[PDB]
Amino acid sequence: KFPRVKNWELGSITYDTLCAQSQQDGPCTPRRCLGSLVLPRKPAEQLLSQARDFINQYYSSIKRSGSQAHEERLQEVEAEVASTGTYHLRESELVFGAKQAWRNAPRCVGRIQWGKLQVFDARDCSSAQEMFTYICNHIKYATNRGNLRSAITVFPQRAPGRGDFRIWNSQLVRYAGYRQQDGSVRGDPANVEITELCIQHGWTPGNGRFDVLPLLLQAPDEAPELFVLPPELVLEVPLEHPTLEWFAALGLRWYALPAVSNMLLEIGGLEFSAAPFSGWYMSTEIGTRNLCDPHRYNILEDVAVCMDLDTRTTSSLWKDKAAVEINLAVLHSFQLAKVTIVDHHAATVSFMKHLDNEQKARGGCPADWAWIVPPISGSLTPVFHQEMVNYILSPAFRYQPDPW
Amino acid sequence: GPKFPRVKNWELGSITYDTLCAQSQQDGPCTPRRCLGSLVLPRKLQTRPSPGPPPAEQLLSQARDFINQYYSSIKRSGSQAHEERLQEVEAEVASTGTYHLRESELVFGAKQAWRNAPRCVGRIQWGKLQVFDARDCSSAQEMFTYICNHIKYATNRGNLRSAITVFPQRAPGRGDFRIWNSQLVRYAGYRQQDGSVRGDPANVEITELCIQHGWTPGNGRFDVLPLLLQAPDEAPELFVLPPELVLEVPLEHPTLEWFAALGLRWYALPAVSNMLLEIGGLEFSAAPFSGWYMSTEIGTRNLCDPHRYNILEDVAVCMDLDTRTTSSLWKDKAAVEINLAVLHSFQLAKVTIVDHHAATVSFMKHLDNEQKARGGCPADWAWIVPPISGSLTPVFHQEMVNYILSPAFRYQPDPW
Ligand code: HEM
Ligand code: HEM
Ligand SMILES: N#Cc1ccc(CCNCc2ccc3ccc(N)nc3c2)cc1Cl
Ligand SMILES: N#Cc1ccc(CCNCc2ccc3ccc(N)nc3c2)cc1Cl
Ligand SMILES: C[C@H](O)[C@H](O)[C@H]1CNc2nc(N)[nH]c(=O)c2N1
Ligand SMILES: C[C@H](O)[C@H](O)[C@H]1CNc2nc(N)[nH]c(=O)c2N1
Ligand SMILES: [Cl-]
Ligand SMILES: [Cl-]
Ligand SMILES: [Zn+2]
């Protein structure tokens, strides 16, 4: 039947009725739960049914279901699909869809913000060069000298029997990973593949630890093109610690803008293979994951040794102590630099509020507990103690294969 | 490729397939439309105490399955002894509605239930379990003796030893053996005149029950509760554990000298007493078991949960942190020092304990052992990942597949 949803800190119970509006399958079955899997395993009226549902959402949202503006808009959509196998969205529909896709994203702890999203229509875009211009404009608007603003730029939708618009980079700002000869990696190991791809497309690589990568941009059925981001567009914060002077030394830095560019935005059955979006960072993404993950910069032992800790044994919690100072250095540095950032306590607190707003507005909120709970200090945050139901609502941000 | 769940580790980049989930005979809470893996007690993780016997062929099929598991585990699968055992069980169930386990079947079952528990990070140890057969027990008084014996053996003056005591199974038209308490050692929770709680809020209800059944209550933060033990069709009787049987560890910190003055302590033995042990369709409603603690259970959940002892702010204030802003990370700092104290104090007291790093590292090893042995390992990620320092442990980066195998430790309704 319905999921009874309990908060174990408060004893409060909700019932999620919004999940009944889900008509796309997640990975689980009654025989086995696969909720911890990062990625999924892998006519014209499926399209039509998806489109009417989106249009119905849209008019429900703006005061006017059943109105004949609703009825003829519906009628435009089948005429177009019946004739061409596809259709097109109006700008206001795209703006609404983009916001619903973020609202529906189970893994985002930042959805309290979901109605505040600058949407750039970049669907009149016929070249990699024009993509670059749009992206440069996205970054200038979003970065806003450190007062970050959420934004999405939407490039032309996929079309049958034509290649996709793609941004090859997973983010607009990424540090190069240089595979070294002897096993190791200089820079960000998460970016070895895209660094190599950049070099094979004629980029002159640096040899630093934090070299900003160029963008590879691809118009349909053309080779990707390389574009170096102008340094003045890419805001970076040098990392220092509020009390440990030696930390600043470490030569650590991170960029301001989390701008994800490899997800597919799906609205009413239409698919936008290139729709980069950005918000601002939660400090644990940088301080815990990007800098402390063993397969990332992996700096835990470095900091721990500078902190003069007992590396020899795990029960001294040297890892735990080191990680706390690194997260504090990230909070400190961003706040010093006047670059928007939110700590995981503030962030999960606002997500609890979002859940409550959502329960009231929709009768639920799809949420992926393993992603909502931060990577340090889990049970110290209120979301740890909150049961959640995970499901797929459309419009949706989806994963899609790397274009190479 | 393979039509089994593909399982990836994102630290190492390595891939496995779970074929063990194919032997799952029981549905979990999830459907293709909605994942409920974050619910603690979804009703598909709960049972119901039916006073009448199981429909004999539902019982028979579970029984046959377990007997096959047993003969497979001693590599006599298909043998004449195997086929004779099945026939014997079919006979027993036919004339009495139930059947009985041989001793070594009971031992195999108890270890398998542990081995199959998706929420236990301690499972590297699953082959080392002392099984106390107490299916002869016939009074609440005798349950007490069996429990004291268990506690003495398991505690072992701080050098802790995993053990389980198994009291008689559910029987057709006869009341259950039940332990009312949730653990053998629990601190009291006294609801206050002003609405707060002195002691452990987790235990308000069992405390009130002990009082109702005649216990004279104390009023400390760490009063050990009496046991409420229930023999078939008898009211629960009250038993007080002799204080010297209950090993406790006072908490101090290795460098923050004031920490000892908080007067915090915890008991050495985690002994869970309210779970149902299910083996081949047989139901052991009283089967308490114990291992030893992972330090985050004490340092993080029991002492720092807002609805538990909730000492975070207290410790943070002693540490002189900025508690009126989140971005100071005062909660994080306090939490580390409280875990350090738990680890340090147990270590000083020579009482077995394992930190969350060491625990999760051993669980990765357990996963690889089980990959080879059985083609998978049912694992509940949300419970396996520790409540602090999540991505700092190897298990965070390990995808897991969750499902119900039997023999199993299951939840059951409170006896009242
Ligand atoms: C405004 C501040 C925001 C914050 C603090 C925030 C926070 C987060 C965090 C911490 C994650 C987990 C990501 C990871 O661990 O890899 C996440 C995921 C996600 N976020 Fe947000 N976010 C923000 C804005 C946005 C915006 C503007 C969008 C889209 C318009 C968005 C869409 C998503 C999606 C689709 C995911 C899933 C990530 C994935 O599957 O890779 N977020 N968010
Ligand atoms: C040997 C040392 C052991 C360690 C370090 C250990 C560790 C843990 C931890 C940390 C949990 C999570 C509990 C929670 O967060 O509430 C757990 C759960 C569990 N353990 Fe183990 N454990 C050990 C031994 C055992 C033994 C001996 C048994 C039974 C024979 C067992 C059966 C279970 C079961 C069934 C759960 C699920 C908890 C639940 O569903 O409520 N464990 N263990
Ligand atoms: N394959 C794969 C894969 C798939 C997903 C991921 C997670 C990447 N998510 C990054 C992300 C996405 C959206 C965000 C929105 C806001 C924000 N502050 N950070 C985000 C960070 C990582 C990998 Cl390696
Ligand atoms: N309702 C409910 C509910 C359901 C489950 C739980 C979890 C209790 N888990 C306790 C436990 C069980 C076995 C253990 C084995 C070893 C160990 N160190 N700790 C354990 C701790 C708590 C509640 Cl309140
Ligand atoms: C295996 C596991 O599901 C995987 O590492 C997930 C867990 N939770 C996460 N949570 C966030 N926010 N980001 C992540 O990348 C992950 N990774
Ligand atoms: C709501 C959520 O399921 C609940 O807080 C869970 C999360 N993970 C857990 N993990 C462990 N080991 N123990 C727990 O009690 C819980 N509680
Ligand atoms: Cl926020
Ligand atoms: Cl262990
Ligand atoms: Zn699931």
Classify residue B63 as left (phi > 0), alpha (psi -120 to 50) or beta.
Answer: alpha
> Quick one: which H or E segment has residue A115?
none
CA of A5 to the centre of ligand 2 (A): 24
Elucidation technique = X-ray
Query: Which phi and psi (to 5°) does residue A319 adopt?
Result: -65, -45
Is residue A243 assigned to a domain? yes
Q: What is the DSSP secondary-structure string of B137-157?
A: --SHHHHHHHHHHHHHHHHGG
- Cα distances (Å, whole numbers) of residue B391 to A110, A119, A307, B359: 20, 33, 21, 14
What residues in B contact A309, CB-CB < 8 Å? Answer: none
B331 alpha carbon, distance to own chain's centre: 28
Q: What CATH number should be reported for the domain holding residue B42?
A: 3.90.340.10
Check B5 against A34: CB less than 8 A apart: yes
Is residue B404 assigned to a domain? no
Resolution of the experimental model in angstroms, please? 2.3
Is residue A389 assigned to a domain? no
β-bridge pairing B265-267 and B248-250: antiparallel
What residues in A contact B326, CB-CB < 8 Å? Answer: 343, 345-346, 349
Note whether B238 and B214 are within 8 A (CB): yes
Question: Of the residues B297, B351, B360, B409, which should be mutated to test ligand 4's pocket, given the most ligand atoms within 8 Å of the CB?
Answer: B297
Is residue A391 assigned to a domain? no
Query: Measuring from atom 9 of ligand 3, which residue has the nearest CA?
Result: A260
Does the CB atom of residue B215 touch ligand 2 within 6 A?
no
Note whether A8 and B307 are within 8 A (CB): yes
A251 in the same domain as A192: no
A110 in the same domain as A48: yes
Give Cβ neighbours of residue B192 (< 8 Å, ≥ 6 apart).
B198
CA of B292 to the centre of ligand 8 (A): 8
B369 in the same domain as B323: no
CA of A374 to the centre of ligand 5 (A): 9
Check A41 against B357: CB less than 8 A apart: no
Axis crossing angle, helix A318-336 with helix B330-348, rounded to the nearest 10: 170
- Cα distances (Å, whole numbers) of residue B72 to A301, B22, B66, B83: 46, 17, 10, 12
B187 in the same domain as B167: no
Q: In what order do the strands lie in the sheet with B237-239?
A: B178-179, B227-230, B237-239
Ligand showing the shortest atom-to-Cα distance for residue A370: 5
Q: What is the DSSP secondary-structure string of B221-287?
A: SSPBPPEEEE-TTS--EEEPPPGGGS-EEE---SS-GGGGGG--EEES--EE-SPEEEETTEEES--
Cβ of B299 under 8 Å from any chain A Cβ? no
A105 in the same domain as A43: yes
B130 in the same domain as B48: yes
Is residue A381 assigned to a domain? no
What sign does the CA torsion over A156, A158, A159, A165 have? positive
CA of A109 to the centre of ligand 7 (A): 8
B27 in the same domain as B126: yes
Widest Cα–Cα separation across chain B = 72
Cβ of A375 under 8 Å from any chain B Cβ? yes
A298 in the same domain as A220: no
A195 in the same domain as A242: no
Q: What CATH number should be reported for the domain holding residue A202?
A: 3.90.440.10
A228 in the same domain as A130: yes
Is residue A386 assigned to a domain? no
Residue A369: helix, strand or coil by DSSP?
helix
Domain containing residue A106: 16-123+150-160+264-278+348-372
A288 in the same domain as A199: no
How far apart are the CA of B175 and the nearest CA of chain A, in angstroms?
A: 31
A interface test, pick of B323, B327, B337, B395 with most A CB neighbours within 10 Å:
B327
Ligand showing the shortest atom-to-Cα distance for residue A152: 1
Q: In what order do the strands lie in the sheet with B271-272?
A: B130-133, B163-166, B289-290, B271-272
Question: In chain A, which among 15-34 make CB contacts under 8 A with chain B?
Answer: 16, 19, 22-23, 25-34
Classify residue B186 as left (phi > 0), alpha (psi -120 to 50) or beta.
Answer: beta
Q: Tokens 């993080």 correspond to what residue?
A: B300
Give the residue from B322, B343, B341 showing the smallest Cα distance to B331.
B322
Name residue A278's beta-bridge partners.
A151, A259
Pocket around ligand 1: residues whose beta carbon is below 6 Å from it?
A 102, 105, 107-110, 113, 117, 150, 152, 277, 279-280, 282, 285, 342, 347, 371, 397
Q: What CATH number should be reported for the domain holding residue A341?
A: 3.90.1230.10
A362 in the same domain as A338: no
Is residue A39 assigned to a domain? yes
How many interchain CB pairs under 8 A, A with B? Answer: 214
One-letter amino acid at B409 equals: F
Which residue of chain B has the CA closest to A3?
A: B36
Task: Report whether the peptide linkage leading into residue B407 is cis, meaning its omega lies within 30 degrees of zero.
Answer: yes
Note whether B253 and B260 are within 8 A (CB): yes
What residues in B contact A281, CB-CB < 8 Å? Answer: none
**Count of the separate structural domains present in chain B:** 3
Name residue B9's beta-bridge partners.
B398
Is residue A10 assigned to a domain? no
